[PDB]
Amino acid sequence: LQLLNRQQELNIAKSSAIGNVRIIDNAVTDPNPVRPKKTIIIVIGVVLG
Amino acid sequence: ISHILDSISQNYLAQNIARQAAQDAKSLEFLNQQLPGRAVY
Description:
- It is classed as membrane protein.
- The entry lists the keywords Wzc, membrane protein.
- Chains A, B are Putative transmembrane protein Wzc.
- The structure is cut from a larger assembly and holds 2 copies of chain A.
- Chain A is mainly α.
- The first copy, chain A, contains 2 helices and no strands.
- At the A-B interface, α1 of A face α2 of B.
């Protein structure tokens, strides 16, 4: 009976198994592109010219 | 802005207290799903 209780506890622990890792924010895409950066490109062009 | 900040603070408080029992809550959920010698029961 002690081994049965231990096996049940191990079943609970195996099934729950919440690890030390958690997903707080799932991925979403920023609708504004990060490249090309138009303003810095045009400023670089003007200054280079 | 004060209403929004009150809502943010209360949401954070509720989320924290909810997470501080997540492992036990999942264990209880699986125990409920696992409920069917009678000493084990």
